[PDB]
Structure formats: structure tokens, C-alpha cells
Amino acid sequence: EEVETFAFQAEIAQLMSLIINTFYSNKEIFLRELISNSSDALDKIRYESLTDPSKLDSGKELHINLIPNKQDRTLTIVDTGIGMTKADLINNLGTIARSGTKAFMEALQAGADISMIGQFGVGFYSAYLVAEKVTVITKHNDDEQYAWESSAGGSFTVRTDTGEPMGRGTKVILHLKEDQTEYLEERRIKEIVKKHSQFIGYPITLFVEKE
Ligand SMILES: CCNC(=O)c1nnn(-c2cc(C(C)C)c(O)cc2O)c1-c1ccc(CNCC2CCCCC2)cc1
């Protein structure tokens, strides 16, 4: 019930600027990066389940779901990956923004393609192209469920979460910007998944809204 607040102990500003000046014309990249993040976490639980199958006591189905919500202007991406402990959450959303931005900027000068963003540990922040705010709910076997949240300003919060428990994995909720509601369209999400994520080795399921 207690909220901790962290300062972006680098320039998340530098990262955000790089991302605008690199993908603002092709915002749809965010879905590719988020889906790819899920796949990595999914690989991790799969791998770990081999040495020790009780790892899957928290859930057997290894998959990714997309869930637009036009009423709430949210697009949510759920996976049953290995999830994140507190430390992993901070590490992956804080510590690695710093070193990852740096590493990526250096490679971009040396001439690397922008499509490499994922490999430098910062693909998640491409969500700030479409979303004013992002919430990340996550659960790892070796820890409690946590909610991370940030508007990409100078800070993010981490709190123990108390809403519906997932058993293992990560849900990213994007509160879209007024002008970016197109990513709530079934047709659009379809194009994107086909265009970017056809070779993801796990089922990606779009949950269509009734209307
Ligand atoms: C301690 C082990 N747990 C995890 O690794 C994990 N668990 N869930 N996720 C995860 C994270 C995100 C972002 C919020 C960071 C996500 O959108 C979906 C996820 O499943 C992650 C996760 C953590 C980090 C990353 C980023 N990997 C970038 C890396 C860079 C070097 C090349 C290979 C790939 C992707 C997913």
C-alpha cells in the first residue's frame, strides 16, 4: 500500500529525445518492442522450467495477449513470462535506461540501424511515442507482485500491487495520447503484428472488444 518514488538517475530526457528523433514517423515500432520484450521473458521461464518444472506451478500457458480498450483509452499487453522481482523491475526500467541509451547512441553514430533499439535494453521507452503514461504490473515466482508507473518525466513509482493477481508475468498498460487512439483499432493492431512480429515463437492473441 506504500509507494516508493525514483528519480531517473540519468537523462531519460536524452533517451526520449533520441526516440522522437528516430521513430516519430513510425510510431508503430512500440508494439514490436513490447511484444519482443514479452518473448524474451517467455523464453526465460521456458528455459528455467527445463532444469526445474515446478517453476511452472505459477502457470503453464506461455503466451502474449493484446487488449485494446476504447472506453478507457488503454492498450494493454500481457505475457506469462518469467516476470520481474523488485530489483529486476528497477534494473530494467531504471539502471539500464542510463547505460542503454549511451551504448545505443554510440552505435547509431557508428552507423547502426535504429531497428537495433531493442538490443540496447531501451525498446520499452518507445511506448512514450503513443502513451502519456505507462503502468507495468509484474509478478516473479521469487517475489511479490509490483506496479511500476511513470509519465517518463523525472521519476517513476514502484509499489506492491493489490489488484487482480496475475500468477506470473508482466502486463504493460499504455494510456494512449488523444491523437494516438488509432492503436485501439483491431484492424491497425493486426497490420502491426503481421508486419513486425510474425516470427515470435509464442501465440499472440488479440482480444477484440464487442461494441
Ligand atoms: C529477471 C528476468 N525478467 C525479465 O527479464 C523480464 N520479465 N518480464 N519482462 C518484461 C519487461 C518488459 C518491459 C516493461 C521492460 C515488458 O514490456 C514485458 C516483459 O515480459 C522482462 C524483461 C526484462 C528485460 C527485457 C529487455 N531485454 C533486452 C535485451 C538487450 C540485449 C539483447 C537481448 C535483449 C525484456 C523483458
Residue numbers in the entry: 15 to 225
From the reporting publication:
The only exception is represented by one residue, namely Lys112 in hHsp90-NTD, which is replaced by a different amino acid in the protozoan counterpart (e.g., Arg97 in Leishmania braziliensis Hsp90-NTD). Therefore, we decided to replace Lys112 with both an arginine (K112R), representing the parasite protein, and an alanine (K112A). To obtain additional insight in this field, we characterized the complex of JMC31 with the K112R variant, the “leishmanized” protein, and the K112A variant, specifically selected to remove the contribution of Lys112 to the ligand binding. The ligand occupies the active pocket in both chains of all structures, and it shows a conserved binding mode stabilized by a tight network of interactions. In all complexes, the residue in position 112, being lysine in hHsp90-NTD, arginine in K112R, and alanine in K112A, points outside the catalytic cavity, thus is not involved in ligand binding within the active site. In agreement with our findings, the contribution of Lys112 to the ligand binding is therefore not crucial and both the human lysine and the parasite arginine are not involved in the interaction with JMC31. The peculiar network of interactions is conserved in each hHsp90-NTD variant and observed both in the substrate and in other ligands and/or inhibitors. To further elucidate the contribution of residue 112 on the ligand binding, the only non-conserved residue between the catalytic pocket of human and parasite proteins, we also solved the crystal structures of our ligand in complex with K112R and K112A variants, structurally characterized in a previous work. These findings show that the scaffold of JMC31 may not be directly exploited to develop protozoan-selective inhibitors as it fails to force the protein in its fully open conformation, in which Lys112/Arg97 point towards the active site.
Heat shock protein 90 (Hsp90) is the most abundant ATP-dependent molecular chaperone that plays a key role in the folding, stabilization, and function of a wide variety of client proteins within the cell. Hsp90 is a functional homodimer composed of two identical subunits, each one consisting of three domains: the N-terminal (NTD), for ATP- and drug-binding and a co-chaperone interacting motif, the middle (MD), for client and co-chaperone binding, and the C-terminal (CTD) domain, for constitutive dimerization as well as co-chaperone and client interaction. Indeed, this domain is structured as a two-layer sandwich, formed by a β-sheet on one side and a cluster of α-helices on the other, delimiting the ATP-binding pocket, a flat-bottomed cone of about 15 Å in depth. In fact, molecules targeting the active site behave as Hsp90 inhibitors by competing with ATP and preventing its hydrolysis.
